[PDB]
Structure 1
């Protein structure tokens, strides 16, 4: 009874419908994203890697309702601990595996940050986060194989905060795209 997209194109079309209105059913979106069976032939044109850091590759702008992007994680690549600027955030595995560590929000005093959950995202799994759930870090579990993930953020946002695990202190970070629609950016 979960609508199953047969292609990434199908999934994008469904997402346009599901985010067209004022309400978004998080569990419905998550189930449909998870139901799409990752097919590298369909997303290889977005899978542009970098030697030193993960890359952000824009796929679709969702008629202004969301950003859909593919993140390419080289061997051992991981993110900072970060927030999500008051948006819905869906993360689906396309290749490999990411470990997601959920963190509590710091208070004003400097302190080591507190882990609230730790898990590995499985093949084709779609996870969900927003600022009320917590902060998180994601990282490629493998030092010999890449990981690829599909991220949907709604509403779109271009900045977030990164947090220092030792103190809780944060810095504003402007997100940049490595490519858009399969075309490398300057």
Structure 2
């Protein structure tokens, strides 16, 4: 029932077709990303880790329609609470496991932020978020093993906001790439 890519290259090809138009079937993209069976022989060239924080590694620019990247989570690495600046955001597990915590948006007043959902993403699972869904934080569940995830953002974006869990106040953050196309960045 679901088109199953046999390789990461197949998946990218399919994604080029699915984002060529103006409409994006979210459930269709999600099912097809999920159907790809993570194969580290195919993506190890992108899996470039850092000791202290997670890294973002650009895989494909999707003809301007999306960014496809691989995120490498060291032992214990996690993100801040953040938004996704009005884009579609798909995240699929390639190795290990991430805990996703969804947060409600803050309003004007200062307040501890409210959790709306908490889950662990299973092997090969693809999750979806946008700003209407909520904010989230994601974290490697393991302090002894890495996690690796495949992210697709459409349209692409280079800035987002990080949120202080104690108050709801936010800061603009510029996103940076650790590598592009398997090549380390300055």
TM-score, with length taken from structure 2? 1.00
> Counterpart of 1:118 in 2: which secondary structure?
strand
Q: Which runs of 4+ in 1 moved over 3 A?
A: none
CA-CA distance at 1:144 after TM superposition: 0.1
RMSD of aligned residue pairs (Cα, Å): 0.1
Gaps of 5+ in 1: none
Question: Could you say which residue in structure 2 is the equivalent of 1:108?
Answer: 108
TM-score after normalising by structure 1? 1.00
Aligned mates of 1:145, 1:117 — CA distance in 2: 24
Q: Report the Cα offset of residue 132 of structure 1.
A: 0.1
In structure 2, the gaps of 5 or more residues are none
SS in 2 for 1:31: helix
CA distance in 1, matches of 2:61, 2:28: 20
The CA distance in 1 between the partners of 2:101 and 2:93, in whole Å, is 15
Give deviations 1:37-67, integer Å, cap 9, x for gaps: 0000000000000000000000000000000
Q: Distance in 2 between matches of 1:16 and 1:80?
A: 30
Distance apart, 1:97 and its partner CA: 0.1
Distance in 2 between the 1:58 and 1:110 partners?
36
Q: What is the 5 A alignment of 1:76-87? A: 76-87=76-87
C-alpha deviation, 1:136, in angstroms: 0.1
Following TM superposition, by how much is the alpha carbon of 1:74 offset from its aligned partner in structure 2, in angstroms? 0.1
Structure 1 distance, partners of 2:65, 2:170, is 27
Q: Distance in 1 between matches of 2:169 and 2:103?
A: 13
CA shift digits 1:20-45 (9 cap, x unpaired): 00000000000000000000000000
CA apart distance, 1:111? 0.2
Structure 2 distance, partners of 1:177, 1:27, is 28
Give the drift of 1:168: 0.1
Q: Report deviation, 1:113.
A: 0.0
Alpha-carbon deviation of 1:134?
0.1
Distance in 2, Cα, partners of 1:51 & 1:158: 23
Counterpart of 1:162 in structure 2 is: 162
Q: Please report how far the alpha carbon of residue 138 of structure 1 lies from its aligned counterpart in structure 2 after TM superposition.
A: 0.1
